[PDB]
Amino acid sequence: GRRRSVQWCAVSNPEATKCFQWQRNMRKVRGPPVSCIKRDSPIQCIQAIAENRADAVTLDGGFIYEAGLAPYKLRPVAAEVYGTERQPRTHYYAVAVVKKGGSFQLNELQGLKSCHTGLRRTAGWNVPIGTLRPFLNWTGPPEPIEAAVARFFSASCVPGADKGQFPNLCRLCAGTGENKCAFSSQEPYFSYSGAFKCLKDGAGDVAFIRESTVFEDLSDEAERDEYELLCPDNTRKPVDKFKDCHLARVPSHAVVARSVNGKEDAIWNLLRQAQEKFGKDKSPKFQLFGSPSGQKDLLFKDSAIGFSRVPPRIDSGLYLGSGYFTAIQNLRKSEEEVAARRARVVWCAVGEQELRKCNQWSGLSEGSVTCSSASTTEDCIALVLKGEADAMSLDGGYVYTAGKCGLVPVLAENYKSAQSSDPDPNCVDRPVEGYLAVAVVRRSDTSLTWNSVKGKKSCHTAVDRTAGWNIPMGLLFNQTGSCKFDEYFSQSCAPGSDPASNLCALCIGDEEGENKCVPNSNERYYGYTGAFRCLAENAGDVAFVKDVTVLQNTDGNNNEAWAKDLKLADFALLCLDGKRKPVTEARSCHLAMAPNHAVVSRMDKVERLKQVLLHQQAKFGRNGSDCPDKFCLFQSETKNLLFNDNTECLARLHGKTTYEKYLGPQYVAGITNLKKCSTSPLLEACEFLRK
Template identity: 35%
Template structure:
């Protein structure tokens, strides 16, 4: 009780300076609810202070952008807005976010498409009539457009305004707030028209437009004005029986579902409403929100007098706050907008041009993980005749995933394990590398691609290699030996290997983290990107500009023992002849070429394929050419990954690149060759014959069920910082 009294008095002190706390409202009903909030506060504050307390003042705005402007120029203090408007308020008007609304499923909403039962599916949206909860809003605009663009259902060359593209896609719409320059997108709206601004409510983001907000978009559909409505799931959480009988959700796969199935049938997930204020007023705003929530929230002491998150007494919905709000979560000062709204969502908004046109939208930013890759990428940029290419420096494949998710880069080629990680982080496939003789432009057809993902086309195998003269080494006695791995998280040298080395420990809860188990299993190793004794064999690179200590065990080519070529170098030892490895775990496809390169590059003289043998799972040792019968398992292809919004841009760029640079007809630059840069497999595997479009297959289908399930089981128990980074995204769905 003392704490509650102290809270009230502390807030009163801040608010009793003679200045009213001014809440911005968007309808007459909100004005009424706001006025009742003011009365309720006066009624419950201590009587001794009531004369000096400044009441809540309710500032009526014309629309949400008028609210933003009023707060900016100190004519109002706070408002709760859709995340799309919140982003604009922060990035374009210099306001700040002080709190988020928290709903039953968290702070995020599902974007859903609703139609009458039996009338429509998601693949037949072109030419229909549509209603949306608001222009540049999370559910009715941003996620919907991201969904359509990622599927190539909507074509936008960035030269046209996006609103013009939408006008050509839908037959007629009501998208409140879209503006007078897009009359087709306001054609279905029903607000009052007037040349007097304060009397014009047509197609405005305010309660006086009947089809405004999610409630209004659903009302628009029910009225028969539209064929489909795009809104957030909060509107249908408590749908009536008649609504459930008459309407259904449109799912991304072309099926439909009942209204209550919004968590599995939706177009995506994004942040809900948040409360904005000015920077110099955020402390007072937080104190005010704390007070009214303490008094009138779901567990409020004075809830019987006034309910903060209920609009029914005022015959409206979502007045001041969404009715589905459970509580308000206060945010830290100076919190980054990307962490408030989510990295994926902010990247989506940038892609949709919420901050205006950007150079980032016109160039492809390729992620490079080493000096050698950067050199090759820069030659690619000079050689390509079409889209501009910018080469972005990163330190590892996991760093590339972070940069793409944060919209600091656009694309990278990832091995199968890193592609799994990237998929968990919300990135999507653009193309896969194809390595066999069957590869070529024709393999983009769906039926061939399905066979490709089943491993029918020239699979790559994970193999274990030892020197022929080390007769005592076999697959059953690798514990306690020196090992060479291409890198941390590599498919063959980390993930598949776990089934045959530390696999016996998988039922021991204390040792199921395979990175930790490898530390105990091997004596010492070079596994670039790892730590501890798994780095003791690594040597770094004397030739790079960075100090050797910073390149040693780096998860990139700056570590000379990185990758397939690096693991082979590790096995034979450094140029002085000192041997560091008893066994090397790598991939078969360029083994013979890499053995030849040992001599050609002067790394180690005199080695031939006859000097090495493969270790088989049954304990045998065979010639290095017998990998088809002596391997640790097939490895899925490398995958080019990007953000969903960038799929079309990256795919078009890659197709143009490989048409002009992917063959040996170009004497200066070859997209799939790396020897001239002193390394192998730079940007793409050197074995790549062609990049195949994957026709909207997801990363799980490309990796294949056995590999995917192995990765699931391993990462459920093995800690990875990159997955922690991705889980920070506020709208990462657990479903």
């Protein structure tokens, strides 16, 4: 009775005239309120937003990019949905439409005339120009890419272009006066329908719009027949074959809002009702997805079917997709700065200590490796998704999440074998054998068995790692089907959980006592070395780690203060049969076999990644040319920074090149079951981007 409104930002008069009826019917039916704001452009609307004079606006992919840049930092909150109620989709295709009768393919457009939807729009600009780049002889900056297309076509209509500098880009626009080639409806050849009309009138030879335009604007089925599409493989096809002939599959326009004090429920509360009441044939009083007779797409795309909420972890970069997002950024770069970026491998580092090591490695790589960093593994996977980082080594737990996200395993960390190989010259081709997940306890604790571990104090590598969480919690879950994971044990140190939770009561933080329960190396109780440490310092009663962990931190194998004096004979293993065994019989006393930490990446980087890695280990490997004279890839002494200190080499996958194949049927069924108790913001973001 004081959240007075969700201030919509309008970009024209008709828009505002559309947004007011909107408001008139909203309160008429007692729906949530919405007041209108006026401006003259998408850019003006982005700015009104960033500075609280409006709350939301639906933009095209091209302006989502721009709205997401600092100093604006808007976020897409709701996606338009297209198709029909039975096959809704939150994506569309950018096609290149032509008239039947000619015989020019997509590689033969130089000197033709073109119609575009507007400067910087997905289908009318970003997509067609990026596809065409090979043909433009562009020199890269500072010469604007606009200049290169202006020499490309004889004439065009590119609403918003600078008439000034690029008269050619404005030649075919139909506006009258200063309206000629403006970025609004005053310009008849603006947007999907203006671009399509520029083609129809015989003003341009190709139109760069969306797959529906031809169907929306040509009523009668036979009129459409006068049209064809230019496919990327230099073939023409019927207009309805868009699926097999499009220049790109793109994210749907979306409503953006502020990242910080955005008013996200108000917006969604409003949209949700509006769709219901005034959606696709619901009210002859007012139509949310339709325009008065002289207009097109006021406020929203005509013939959209509703909205789809965008999960909170999503930002512009993630919304656009690595392909699209990077393609946009590549419009402002030379072909040389772009090829240099394709050749280079950017590593994602989890914590300062991994960054430091990565920096070290960076300088010795003769320009092949660079560093990016984040404070959680999840944040690094997000960075690889935005194309902003390319790779990292991951626990099988995280390869699940990464694979759900469409990433792929490329090389695996190889460890000593079932005692085959000696100081193995064929370690890159020696198939991986899994590591053993164990439950360790102090020998003194005579009474501690698997059977009575529950309710005790536990130490975990981190939430969602194989040895440290999936295996122990999975086995336990399987006995009571309870999802109340913070009740399995009285207290714990399970990094990456809520620090206000039981699950974090034993974490001790970094050397100063900050960073408690964070899922990176600043928490002294993190990972393998840290969950072991949690045991040896008597914080916990059981540590869920791997068997070589104990070997490595006892018998003067780790001189660090806390470790110095630990003897193997003091720790024992819990077997699933009730028994306890010495650490050396882990092979007959373990919880499960865990898939090897694997390095993951985007599909586009696989083959270049493979080569940099092979090359780099040949030199900084276990038995490598510069280790230890200068740098050792695989050593950080007990720290397990970037890779596990016991990696012999990075070996080949043998065909298992998908998270499913790599991890195994059984592993994947299990996590999948656990995940049902709770998913992360990240898995929610990726389900959304995958439909």
